[model samples]
Target chain A: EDFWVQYGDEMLPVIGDFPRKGDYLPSFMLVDDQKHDAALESFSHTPKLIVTLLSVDEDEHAGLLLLRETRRFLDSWPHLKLIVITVDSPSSLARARHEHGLPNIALLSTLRGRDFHKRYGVLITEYPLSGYTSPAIILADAANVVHYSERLANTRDFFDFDAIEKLLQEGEQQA
Target chain B: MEDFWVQYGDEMLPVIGDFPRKGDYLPSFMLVDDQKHDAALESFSHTPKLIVTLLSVDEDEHAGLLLLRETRRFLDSWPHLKLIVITVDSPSSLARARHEHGLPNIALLSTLRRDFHKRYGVLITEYPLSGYTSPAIILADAANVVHYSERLANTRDFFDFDAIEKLLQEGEQ
Candidate 1:
């Protein structure tokens, strides 16, 4: 199904098919906070993963809020890894990390190329908000199969933490 | 035509077309002025030097604001140089920018023509965000021949002011 997200009054079309439940997370190469190349295989050791795609250029406050909230959520699930992919540069991410007291989350930048956004289906290709990524959160298993995914117009949208917790517990029971 | 690429972090991405070079003449195009009137390249012929900046007002506000501030300072020392700013923003959004930024003497223009962006070699067609043009600054001499051109890879990238000033001084001699 074609995916769309709201920007002001317009429903902008996303560039690719966004990952849904059961869809395998696409392989991506992004720059990590250490300025090293990181890919899906980099975090292969983790049993579970939470990935959030954001654009700080669109709204810095909202991005920070999403990161902080996700960080807080991961406090209890220390075994699960949280990877944040943003269009912002590494330097900017560094400044935000230090200034906002954000830690533990693996911050990544899309500075390497433009295709990463499309591969994840978070790219917004319309006027006014073009070139920005639609804020989204995805939960996937160690094998890279997504179990939960949601695209948000903004961070203000209610995140179904209960659903995420439910999925996490279910996986734990099967293990 | 040779291909041009810009480095962003560790990776390089190709620009859409051949960016104007030192000896190349600027492509002719028309855009809507701040007053909502048609402004063509020929209209500024009387000016000896022109600094044309292409950016998105809505998405790239930091760069747009920086250009305005820098251009204002540059005009103080070089009064004869004309500054023209182009964006893909709508007329209403451009008006809001003018009112908010208090852009005086600078010719701010908006265009719905995608060809204009492609002609300047600033159009970004390969990226997922393909419709918008790259943030660029071009310096043209009296005859509309390009003297210097730069396309930024990201919003954090800026124009080379020292090189721009040196070229402007060379034009005086």
Candidate 2:
């Protein structure tokens, strides 16, 4: 099935099929802050993985604010590993990390020009802003099975962190 | 023919075909103009020289702005040289880009046609950010024979203004 996101009055078509609950998150190659290739299996050792995809270059303030909020949540749930994949270049991400004093999170970018947006089903081909991925957050277990996936209309859109927290806690109990 | 790859950081991503060099004729294409009308390569054949630039406004806004500014600066002396800026953005995005960048003189065209990138040898297929053409600049003569061409490694790369000026002068004679 095709996916669409409402941008203003227009419904823009996202390129690929978005992963949903029970779907296995596809493997991708993203570059870390140091420009090393990081794949989905790289973080396979974590108990729970929270992958947030955004365009840091578009709005630095919003991106930073989201990171701060996520950081606070991670403080309490230390088992949950956070991986941020953005369209920002490696240099920009590295600089943002150093300046913001952001640590403990795996910041990555499609710096080598990969088809990440298509693979993740976030590539917005239509305009006001074309060639960018729709803001999204995906929750996956240790085996890369997605438990929750949400694609937001805007970068500043509301995220259900409480719901995500609940799922993580439930998974902990079941384990 | 063997496929060529360019080094981007540590990874080597394949460049589909060779970029058009000096003396080669650019492939024909039909793109959407600022007025939302169809425009072709032959449409601008009246000009003595043409500067064709391919970029994604959403991906590299700063680079697009810089190229526009540089082209405007160059036009001060060579006012007759026409500039055609082609992008993979939508018509609305192209309109926004023109207004934001404040370059009304240049022609801003959007490519709805997917093969345009491949025919020009800028299609990026294997990388994580595949499906878009590499940011490029191609200078062509009145007959559409390419005199200069460059495919930027990244958005941060800049044009060689000195070389461009020298070529513009040479083309005049």
Candidate 3:
């Protein structure tokens, strides 16, 4: 929880400098609308970016807009796995899926309000304004250890494509 | 899927026909939530509703819960769509849970009062500690007309969220 304390309450899970094998990520059980269930480790063979977004409907414009930018980032680094976890309902998820034209990616959700926060021990967004953040982008190494994590204070920062391009480059260097 | 067969044999298959089949209206029942508020099923006359039954946290764990949560955004976005989760746990257990660990964004119903099996056309496994067997998913329109219903063939079927997603999309028109 120190991460929460150190870098605003919105930054969470206190990702360690070096992830150990025992570390657990809710992504391990993330499933898509289809019945295919894959472990987070399944994508661990390569770098993965797990973005926890606030309610897709509540943060519609920001969420969808950021997703567009994230897609471009993924285009630059085709190898990285992009998994999004949200507090959105099934229909809201479907709408977002349709609007974003989200590429092949695993999108998961929590059952109740703030559930993503409860289960993953991460911040979707800070308190008083829950499930809405600039959105955190955590880059994990091939082994699923979080090597780099960043959450832009301003949602517009997402459009600053150069920042994320550099972020992916840094992730590639560490990997 | 095999776990489903092993848990409940073919004898329980007959219960499927008792449900408010496609083009029929779902049976009405009064159920309470974690807040201890009693709500009649018929009260949800304007919005479409999805009711799913869970035998126990042990029997289903996060399986059914996760499915609902994952699709929560979709459910919330539709002005007339509601998701009701029914559990077979005792009312007292639910009361305590409500007091200790409140789960917002979920409407949980306890099954002790109506003996959900008879109320919802489900079968409770006798051999094991009494609990509902198959997962029954009911989608009803605002007029209380049944649109889709399923006594899940397997636990994995809960992850097939697209069915309801499409159902809501179709409702838009």
Candidate 4:
């Protein structure tokens, strides 16, 4: 606690447009497929790869591409946890997954638009990239320190794929 | 679109409770504040208020943004005229707008994971529910009498601003 307060001022700006480093992540609840509470705290002790999506209906291809990349990188980083958070009704997400080939991951959770904004920084989550809704990416280390944060632009798909991949690789090398 | 009009009729669809008459008092409700704590509606008593009910951003985005902009200046001088915005938006959205948006004159209430339509009967009148989800405005006297109530139509103009202006002027006279 003393270290955080002593160093917090200097590192607060490092997060740029998102939550600061050394700041404890706020505990958040995500609804599971059964629409029950799935706390983010359950995934503690592992570095978190968190991504936000507007909907599977609107971003199915992008989501699929994301899953492919994460799945490929999962072998390289055994302890990295991926959470795909979507602002869609659980029922809607379920149907989209059935119609489209949304792969089953351990931590696919559903969120509402407002809750998504609240859990993530409102401005960062909602920062518009042209016409597309920006996705907030955070590489939260095991201690829950936000080491890297980025908002992918809407001008092109896979805008921050390489960036996320690089962060995971760096973490793997350190381990 | 055609089906909506086909189903729509002349009479306002009867909600569970009758719309309060011009002199009737509002029902008591405990709404959740931005801090996720319960607040009584009657707490703001003895001040005339303009309460706007918004369902969500998806439904009332246009009306909500417009109302915030139009009333920004009007509210500062009209301090006695308290502005309360009630919405079915998630708890997070309500807090963000209250803290960040330049809407100082409003108290935002959230009906998180609850049946807001059933509790308030806000947009229950317009059958098929599309029109009901739009913004609705209510004017209440200091004593809580319903001075005016109008659900906004699809049009841009909010419920007869001139009519409200006239009411205020009459009150002053």
The candidate with the higher lDDT, 2 or 3, is 2
Second chain of candidate 4: TM-score?
0.74
Q: What C-alpha lDDT, on a 0 to 100 scale, does residue A38 get in candidate 1? A: 74
Estimate every model's Cα lDDT from 0 to 1. Answer: 0.65, 0.66, 0.52, 0.52
lDDT of 4 at A68: 58
What does DockQ come to for candidate 4?
0.04
* Number of clashes recorded per candidate: 0, 8, 14, 0
lDDT of 3 by residue, A58-129 (tens): 333346557666777778788888877654333235445665567776665432222335445444333223
Q: What does the i-RMS of model 4 come to?
A: 12.6
User: lDDT by residue for model 4 over B30-61, one digit each (tens)?
Assistant: 66655445657677877888877653332323
RMSD of each: 7.8, 6.3, 13.8, 13.2
**How well does chain A score by TM in each candidate?**
0.86, 0.85, 0.64, 0.65
Question: Each model's TM-score, in the order given?
Answer: 0.61, 0.63, 0.43, 0.46
Q: Write the per-residue lDDT of candidate 3 for residues B1-173, one digit (tens) a residue.
A: 22223123323323322555679877777665544356577656577777776543223233344554554555666656677777644233344334434446456765433244555666533322123434667777777788887666544445356776787678677
Clashes of 1: 0
Docking class of 4: incorrect
> lDDT (0-100) at residue B142 of candidate 3?
74
Error of 4 at A23 (Å): 36
Instruction: For model 3, give the RMSD to the true fold.
Output: 13.8
Distance from true location, Cα of A148 in model 4, Å: 27
Model 3 chain A weakest lDDT span, ten residues long? A11-20
